[PDB]
Amino acid sequence: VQLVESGGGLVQAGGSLRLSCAASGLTVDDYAIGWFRQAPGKEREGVSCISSSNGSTYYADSVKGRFTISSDNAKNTAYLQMNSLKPEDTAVYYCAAAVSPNLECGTGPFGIYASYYGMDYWGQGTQVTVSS
Amino acid sequence: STGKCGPPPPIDNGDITSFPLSVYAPASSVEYQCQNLYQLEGNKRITCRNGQWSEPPKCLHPCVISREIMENYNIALRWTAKQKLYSRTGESVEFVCKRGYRLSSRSHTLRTTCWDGKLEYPTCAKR
C-alpha cells in the first residue's frame, strides 16, 4: 500500500489548489481516505475525509465551504479541491487511508478525540504555502 | 448463636441490588451488581449460613486508553467502527503506529487484550 500526494505548492491568498492522492496496493474496496495537515509546532488537524462505501464526508470547521472532497476510483485517487485559500492554510498536507470496514467520516481521527486515533497508511506529505 | 449475619461485605466497583439491612437471617441472600463497564467474576449471590457469608464476587476493571502511554510508544488507536476510548475486560484493542513509524521488532502485535484494567501497549520506532 502506497499513497502519493501531488498538487501542492505556493499560491496567492484567495487562490485555489487541487490536492491529489493516488492509492496503489489497496486490497479492500470499503475504505476511508483522509487529508490531514500540520504546521511546524501545532497539532495535526484532520481536514477532510471520504468513505468509498457509505459516501460519508467530513470537513474541519476551519475549511467547511472552501474545500470539496471527491474520489475518481478508476484512477484509484482522491482529490481535495481547495478554494479561497488563506495564510492559515499554510501547512504540510498528508493523504491517509483507513481500511477497517464501515468507517463513518467525522469519527475517530476526525472527531474531538482525534489525538487518540491514527490511520492505517500515510503519504510523505506535500507543502502548501499561501502568501498574504 | 442463631445463624444471623452482619451486613454483607463491600466490593470495589460494585454494590448489592437490595436495601442494606443491619442484620440478615440464616438462608438470606443478597445479589451484587458491578458498576457500568465492570464485569462481574464469581458468585452474583452470596448466602448467610452459620453466621457468616459465602465468598463475594469481584468487579473486573475495564482498560482506559492512555494518551500519555501511546505518545511514549509512537502508537494510536486504530480507526474502527466500534473502538472507543476504553475497552471492557476481555475485549481486544487494535493500535496503529504514528505516521513515520513501524512496529518495533521486539513488540506485541498491534492487537492486544484488555484484562482487568491491564493492557500491553505495542511500540513502534522511526523508519
Residue numbers in the entry:
A (entry chain B): 2 to 133
B (entry chain A): 1105 to 1231
The article reads:
On host cells, activation of the alternative pathway is controlled by complement factor H (CFH) and complement factor I (CFI). CFH is a cofactor for the protease CFI that degrades C3b, resulting in inactive C3b (iC3b). Moreover, CFH recognizes glycosaminoglycans and sialic acid (SA) glycans as self-markers. In this study, we generated a VHH antibody that binds tightly to the highly flexible Leu1181–Leu1189 loop of CCP20, which is the region autoantibodies often recognize in antibody-mediated aHUS.
To investigate the molecular mechanism by which VHH4 induces hemolysis, we crystallized the complex of the C-terminal region of CFH and VHH4 and determined the structure at a resolution of 2.6 Å. The crystal structure revealed that VHH4 recognized the loop Leu1181–Leu1189CCP20 belonging to the CCP20 domain using complementarity-determining region 3 (CDR3). Importantly, this loop corresponds to a region previously reported to be the epitope of anti-CFH AAbs. Specifically, the binding of VHH4 pushed the loop of CFH toward the side of SA, thereby causing steric hindrance between the loop and SA. The residue Trp1183CCP20 belonging to this loop, and necessary for the interaction with SA, is now surrounded by the VHH4 CDR3 loop. Sequence analysis using abYsis revealed that among VHHs, the antibody VHH4 possessed a remarkably long CDR3 region consisting of 24 residues (Ala99-Tyr122VHH4), remarkably long among VHHs. Second, an intramolecular disulfide bond in the antibody was formed between Cys106VHH4 of the CDR3 and Cys50VHH4 of the framework region, thus stabilizing the conformation of the CDR3 loop. Based on the calculations of the PISA server, in interface 1, a salt bridge was formed between Arg1182CCP20 and Asp121VHH4. In interface 4, Tyr95VHH4 and Trp123VHH4 were predicted to interact with Arg1203CCP20 and a hydrogen bond and a cation–π interaction were observed between Tyr95VHH4 and Arg1203CCP20.
